Design a binder for this molecule. Sequence first.
Ligand SMILES: Cc1cnc(O)c(C)n1
Ligand SMILES: Cc1cnc(O)c(C)n1
Lengths: 228, 226
Amino acid sequence: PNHLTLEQISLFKQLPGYWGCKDLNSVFVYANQAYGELIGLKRAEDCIGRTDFEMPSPTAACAAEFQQQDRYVIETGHSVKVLDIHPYPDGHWHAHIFTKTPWRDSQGKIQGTIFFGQDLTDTAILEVGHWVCRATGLSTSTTFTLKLTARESEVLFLLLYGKKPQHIARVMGISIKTVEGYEAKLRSKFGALSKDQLIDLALDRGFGSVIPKTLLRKQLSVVLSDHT
Amino acid sequence: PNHLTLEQISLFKQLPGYWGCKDLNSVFVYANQAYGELIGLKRAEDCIGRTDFEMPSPTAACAAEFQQQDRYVIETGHSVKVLDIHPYPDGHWHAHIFTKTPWRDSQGKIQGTIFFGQDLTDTAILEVGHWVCRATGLSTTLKLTARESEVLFLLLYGKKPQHIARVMGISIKTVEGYEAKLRSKFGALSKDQLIDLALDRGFGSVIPKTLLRKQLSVVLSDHTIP
DNA sequence: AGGGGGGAAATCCCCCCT
DNA sequence: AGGGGGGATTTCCCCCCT
Ligand SMILES: Cc1cnc(O)c(C)n1
Ligand SMILES: Cc1cnc(O)c(C)n1
């Protein structure tokens, strides 16, 4: 089939995420509309023939890291997953996970890079171990407000990753008794009786893949290590 | 631009992930090459016209959960995040996150669902939390047995000894003659340093498939599409 | 807000076994 | 693979102080 039917082409324009491809020079060959608007372009085709340096977004300050990641995918043939935290022309900070894989020509030779970004909230981090543990006994599956202060959010964040009170008190510059007060305030807001129950309720309400706004402070583009 | 160029079509066939779409009845309209192979169809066109019940895969045992999630997307218009744990015709257990969104038509009416799955059995992104801590100033060859890998996985996700013992069906004393051996071959002096070191060796990406023993298809969350 | 006392319970990590 | 003993050190969660 040298052609896609028109309904399949509608899938092309509707797939989720922020994605496209670049050639061996990391100059854009195609970007979808989602990525175009995220990077500040009403017409996603204006990305074509631009590099990451030439885009009207604060992400251009990280263009070198993107290209370094692209060169690694191109030379090694391995695919990678990148954590990205940046401010965007819409005025807010966003965290993404960008998958990067070799883009191959009609005969298998590498001709560039394919990127695919997902918003962090469409990904799973701590909910993975939360549910692997639940496979002992039997649970049930049925899907279904609350406001936290800046420090309440940071403490919850560190709790869900298993950081102990001695660790949390050191990294936040406060007393261990101060942390206990925040665990109590969090235990109250979630309607939890114990700390272990607080962890459970918070993971069920999505906090396992939430980075609190107060920690979207510095631009970052790191390749997360995998074992091939 | 009512036509894609042929190189834009090459991107369509190579886009990463396991994805495709289904109509209002959850009958497969399209499935990409990666998904067809994951399910057991060497040629993905064979997916078309089938439902989740009719796939040559043990995942067909959860087809009703799939269609339930499908109907929820059709009903609400939300995007839905599903955790999936299943055995597949390649003889292995896998852990995927499938994202499901409405599939719309020319006038915007919902005509089915789009699924998009990513394998994280060996590409888990746990290290995200560690990277956020370091960048914000809130932080400071190996061969493992199957049982050691389990304990390490549970430590990396912050589980406590009582929790790890209950999960693994052994005593805490045994979950110590394991943390001890992990502390050794990682060269860590404290359980804290073992977590940090292992995270930097990339073990946050691993899900020990010895812990993948029951099929699971559960909705983790959903959200509005702006 | 940030910091604290105190006591039951749990952890951490040394040592010991089949 | 699966178990402990024991003791220094911390959680844990109820009170409480500026
Ligand atoms: C936001 C972002 C991060 N990495 C990339 O490679 C691109 C193209 N965009
Ligand atoms: C493996 C899998 C899980 N959920 C789905 O909806 C599909 C189509 N496949």
